[PDB]
Design a protein around this ligand. Structure first.
Ligand SMILES: *[C@@H]1O[C@H](CO)[C@@H](O[C@@H]2O[C@H](CO)[C@@H](O)[C@H](O)[C@H]2NC(C)=O)[C@H](O)[C@H]1NC(C)=O
Ligand SMILES: *[C@@H]1O[C@H](CO)[C@@H](O)[C@H](O)[C@H]1NC(C)=O
Ligand SMILES: *[C@@H]1O[C@H](CO)[C@@H](O)[C@H](O)[C@H]1NC(C)=O
Ligand SMILES: *[C@@H]1O[C@H](CO)[C@@H](O)[C@H](O)[C@H]1NC(C)=O
Ligand SMILES: *[C@@H]1O[C@H](CO)[C@@H](O)[C@H](O)[C@H]1NC(C)=O
Ligand SMILES: *[C@@H]1O[C@H](CO)[C@@H](O)[C@H](O)[C@H]1NC(C)=O
Ligand SMILES: *[C@@H]1O[C@H](CO)[C@@H](O)[C@H](O)[C@H]1NC(C)=O
Lengths: 43, 115, 45, 49, 49
């Protein structure tokens, strides 16, 4: 069963990243993606 | 600016590092599709801002120092490509006493075996 | 405003390398989560 | 403060602040060795500002 | 373009060479504060192409 609910929005997925004095993270892989964008130029 | 050349202003031409765009027609408008590069699978490493040899400081150019648990190496900031640190990877500047966290290290000279 | 993908939590120390950020990052002791300069700007208008 | 320019693509990356400065100087054609020679001066000027 | 990366277009992000920006909230608006590099104390020298 489904019904109409009301609630308080969750602005995002709260994440915590530790801070270290002498450490770095270096990506070892990559990916390609295609985005799609639309704009109206006529009336 | 996107179709005729590679843009260099963040998020203007795709949500990533931008390679290309292709236009497609549409009624009363136009549609763009952006090809973008996205890295992933990062690894935590150990660093040192500079290294001391012969009592002199060597800074890196076009890279950053990293430690993999066996020996120090320099890599690109985007893709992991370790290379053996050698004289032409670096330029000498300043002095070791002036800087924080400099680490004793040995840099290879490729004229050493030739003599 | 809403272009951040995930909201990182405020760090504990406010002093990195000498750079003092305590004026722009908030602090728990004060009742308001607003920052110092934010709460000054909010006063003037 | 910690990620810098890197959390614009991917999630984020970790790098100490004082190593970020060597990059943002190298972006303006000032050789990165300018920073570590007199880091204290820049820090004090920043706080006074 | 200012907060998430180093801009390279003159006077867009501060009146100088640009390093960073930090946003602060305000009523009905937003306030930016730009950190910029400014050189001084020039000396006259002799050149040859
Ligand atoms: C960074 O600046 C803050 C200012 O907000 C300093 O904290 C103040 O220090 C003075 C000096 O004793 C105290 O009287 C204030 O009560 C402190 N808090 C304020 C003004 O909110 C802080 O000390 C500075 N950082 C360091 C490492 O000294
Ligand atoms: C920074 O390095 C110093 C020197 O070893 C160390 O004492 C400290 O724990 C490190 N981390 C900081 C200051 O966050
Ligand atoms: C990267 O991830 C891909 C998966 O798309 C995998 O096939 C590949 O082995 C990984 N490593 C490299 C170096 O490409
Ligand atoms: C990677 O980060 C984790 C926490 O996210 C930490 O426990 C670990 O020590 C890091 N790896 C290093 C420093 O090599
Ligand atoms: C560090 O890199 C070197 C050079 O490729 C390699 O021989 C060594 O195994 C690496 N260290 C570890 C812990 O794998
Ligand atoms: C090595 O580093 C130590 C401190 O980390 C320093 O006292 C010494 O002068 C450096 N060089 C040699 C050859 O030990
Ligand atoms: C510097 O400029 C002054 C005039 O502004 C001139 O007299 C002087 O010769 C210059 N210094 C040189 C050319 O070394």
């Amino acid at each position: 069963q489904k019904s109409i609910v009301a609630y308080t929005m969750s602005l995002g997925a709260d994440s915590s990243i530790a801070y270290s004095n002498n450490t770095i993270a270096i990506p070892t892989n990559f990916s390609i993606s295609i985005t799609t964008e639309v704009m109206p130029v006529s009336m | 600016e996107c179709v005729l050349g590679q843009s260099k202003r963040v998020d203007f031409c795709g949500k990533g590092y931008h390679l290309m765009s292709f236009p497609q027609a549409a009624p009363h408008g136009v549609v763009f599709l952006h090809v973008t590069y996205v890295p992933s699978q990062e690894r935590n490493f150990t660093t040192a801002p500079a290294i001391c040899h012969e009592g002199k400081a060597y800074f890196p150019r076009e890279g950053v120092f990293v430690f993999n648990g066996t020996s120090w190496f320099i890599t690109q900031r985007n893709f992991f490509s370790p290379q053996i640190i050698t004289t032409d990877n670096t330029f000498v500047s300043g002095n070791c006493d002036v800087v924080i966290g400099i680490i004793n290290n040995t840099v290879y000279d490729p004229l050493q075996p030739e003599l | 405003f809403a272009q951040v993908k995930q909201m990182y939590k405020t760090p504990t120390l406010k002093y990195f390398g000498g750079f003092n950020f305590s004026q722009i990052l908030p602090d728990p002791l004060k009742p308001t989560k607003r920052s110092f300069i934010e709460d000054l700007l909010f006063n003037k208008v | 403060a910690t990620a810098g320019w890197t959390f614009g693509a991917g999630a984020a990356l970790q790098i100490p602040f004082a190593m970020q400065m060597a990059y943002r100087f190298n972006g303006i054609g000032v050789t990165q060795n300018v920073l570590y020679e007199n880091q204290k001066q820049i820090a004090n000027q920043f706080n006074k500002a």
